[PDB]
Design a protein around this ligand. Structure first.
Ligand SMILES: *[C@@H]1O[C@H](CO)[C@@H](O[C@@H]2O[C@H](CO)[C@@H](O[C@@H]3O[C@H](CO[C@@H]4O[C@H](CO)[C@@H](O)[C@H](O)[C@@H]4O)[C@@H](O)[C@H](O)[C@@H]3O[C@@H]3O[C@H](CO)[C@@H](O)[C@H](O)[C@@H]3O[C@@H]3O[C@H](CO)[C@@H](O)[C@H](O)[C@@H]3O[C@@H]3O[C@H](CO)[C@@H](O)[C@H](O)[C@@H]3O)[C@H](O)[C@H]2NC(C)=O)[C@H](O)[C@H]1NC(C)=O
Ligand SMILES: *[C@@H]1O[C@H](CO)[C@@H](O)[C@H](O)[C@H]1NC(C)=O
Lengths: 59, 134, 300
């Protein structure tokens, strides 16, 4: 079972019969909510990686 | 000195030609793949850039090849255009191509910055709900 | 309105940025000087989930373990989600590491060290001078007449296409960027930017300047006006907008509660605005604003 990023658990009953999840409010800086969870969850993969990215034109 | 050629090698029915309409280039000719080869004109090496786009909307992109002699500046109108055409097709304005050739030696006269096409294309407007325009 | 500066002794003196600082003190701010070449932490931005300083301005350092000891990335994020304001700059001779990863995490990409821009059509061949007909945005600084801003050796940035980017100044149309090699590696043309800004939700602003010698005492004659104006925009002192209460009712006096709406009839809608120039709230006049009556799909 992989982890979810866009939701979070709020209440879960006694014998695990009803589970209630809540939509997580949107990111205050434009970042996709998968990328911030991957940044927090995995503090490995450190590197220098000086290379220019492949972007489109700012219109 | 050197000579430089140019050709789109497009994937559509577009780009009718107009032409050009201090250290000037002489002329441009069409051999009608679909080469638009000019004649020799030079000032200095070490800087060479072809600019396609329009500066009224501050939107352009740069192509920098060399095969050196002679140069090749092929401009694919199928893959190497992203959102310039979708601005170009709403309000009909001719997109331009401009040649930059310069270097550091103090020869102000020997510098080259002048557009040498005024082309006009009609492939398709074709909004695919591509939001990243305005 | 407690600020907090970060200066490096080894690269520049601190008295070289003098005339912009204490005029900054004149409208009742309070500074806080803080070294990076003296080994004692003493900087807790957040204490027991309470943020202390309102503002941060930094100065260009040569990387180092000291800046990573003072503030790493996660305190900049958690500081910046709680309405703190940042003025930060870099240099071609020295780009720090955590600042570069913080800004790449925001959405603007500055060029690393060794890459420097240059122009072969400029009227002076030593420094790099940009004319005042490149200014994109208008609500931050509006150029009254023609001016010529002076930079030194400087870096350029290239950015993404988000809603929140506010670019201020641009590169000349005949520029490029070189490393030790021979090309236009990082950016080329007028797609490099030299002063950019960033607003966000829960409104809080930061600015990036791509040049070291833009706030020097020796260069104060040329660009004194522009620098003061950025220093007002960044600290939430100009161009803020407040919204007056919005009501809606029947065409007549009766409110919605007393007669709830039928399938069709006549209503109206009104709203009001206000703008703060530093001292008073004044009325804000704008030609276009719009109303939308949507269910899942706009109707009106
Ligand atoms: C049970 O549940 C269902 C799901 O919840 C309900 O279904 C929904 O119903 C609504 C309306 O009943 C649907 O809205 C439609 O969408 C169609 C489809 O267009 C296409 O939509 C797809 C996405 O699905 C999109 O990718 C395509 O590009 C394409 O647009 C659309 O043609 C309809 O017109 C309407 O779409 C809009 O309607 C709203 C207002 O209703 C406007 O904001 C918008 O501009 C647009 O067109 C309008 O058309 C009106 C009359 O048709 C007219 O009054 C407006 O002025 C406006 O524009 C006009 O356009 C025409 C021609 O272009 C001109 O002649 C004219 O001058 C003017 O310019 C919705 O899609 C649908 N949802 C799903 C999932 O199917 C269902 O109702 C419910 N049953 C019930 C309640 O009984
Ligand atoms: C700055 O750091 C260097 C490196 O350790 C040190 O030698 C020097 O004394 C420090 N202070 C100044 C004023 O240069």
């Amino acid at each position: 079972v992989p982890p979810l990023d866009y939701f979070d658990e709020v209440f879960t009953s006694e014998n695990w019969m009803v589970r209630i999840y809540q939509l997580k409010k949107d990111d205050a800086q434009g970042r996709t909510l998968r990328d911030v969870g991957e940044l927090t969850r995995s503090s490995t993969k450190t590197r220098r990686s000086i290379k220019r990215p492949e972007l489109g034109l700012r219109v | 000195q050197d000579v430089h050629v140019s050709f789109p090698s497009t994937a559509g029915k577009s780009r009718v030609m107009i032409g050009k309409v201090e250290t000037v280039p002489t002329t441009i000719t069409v051999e009608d793949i679909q080469v638009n080869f000019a004649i020799e004109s030079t000032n200095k090496p070490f800087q060479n850039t072809l600019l396609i786009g329009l500066p009224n909307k501050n939107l352009e992109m740069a192509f920098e090849p060399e095969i050196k002699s002679m140069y090749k500046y092929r401009i694919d109108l199928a893959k190497l255009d992203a959102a310039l055409l979708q601005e170009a097709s709403r309000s009909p304005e001719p997109i331009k191509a401009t040649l930059i050739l310069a270097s550091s030696t103090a020869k102000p006269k020997e510098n080259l910055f002048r557009e040498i096409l005024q082309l006009n294309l009609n492939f398709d407007v074709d909004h695919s709900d591509s939001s990243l325009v305005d | 309105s407690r600020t907090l500066v970060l200066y490096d002794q080894s690269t520049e003196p601190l008295e070289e940025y003098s005339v912009y600082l204490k005029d900054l003190e004149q409208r009742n701010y309070k500074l806080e000087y803080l070294d990076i070449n003296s080994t004692s932490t003493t900087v807790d931005l957040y204490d027991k989930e309470q943020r202390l300083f309102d503002n941060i301005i930094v100065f260009p350092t040569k990387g180092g373990k000291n800046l990573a000891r003072q503030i790493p990335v996660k305190q900049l994020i958690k500081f910046f989600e709680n309405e703190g304001n940042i003025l930060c700059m870099s240099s071609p001779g020295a780009v720090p590491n955590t600042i570069r990863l913080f800004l790449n995490e925001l959405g603007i990409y500055p060029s690393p060290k060794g890459h420097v821009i240059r122009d072969y059509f400029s009227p002076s061949s030593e420094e790099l001078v940009v004319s005042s007909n490149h200014l994109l945005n208008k609500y931050v600084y509006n150029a009254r007449k023609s001016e010529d801003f002076v930079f030194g050796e400087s870096s350029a940035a290239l950015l993404e296409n988000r809603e929140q980017i506010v670019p201020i100044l641009n590169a000349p149309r005949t520029s490029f960027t070189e490393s030790k090699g021979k090309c236009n590696s990082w950016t080329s043309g007028s797609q490099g930017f030299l002063v950019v800004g960033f607003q966000n939700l829960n409104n809080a602003r930061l600015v990036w300047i791509g040049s070291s010698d833009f706030l020097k005492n020796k260069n104060q004659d040329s660009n004194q006006e522009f620098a003061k104006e950025l220093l007002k925009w960044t600290f939430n002192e100009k161009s803020v907008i407040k919204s007056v209460h919005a009501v809606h009712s029947h065409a007549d006096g009766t409110s919605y509660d007393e007669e709830p709406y039928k399938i069709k009839d006549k209503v109206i809608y009104s709203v009001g605005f206000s703008e703060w120039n530093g001292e008073e709230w004044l009325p804000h006049i704008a030609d276009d604003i719009q109303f939308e009556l949507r269910q899942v799909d706009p109707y009106y």
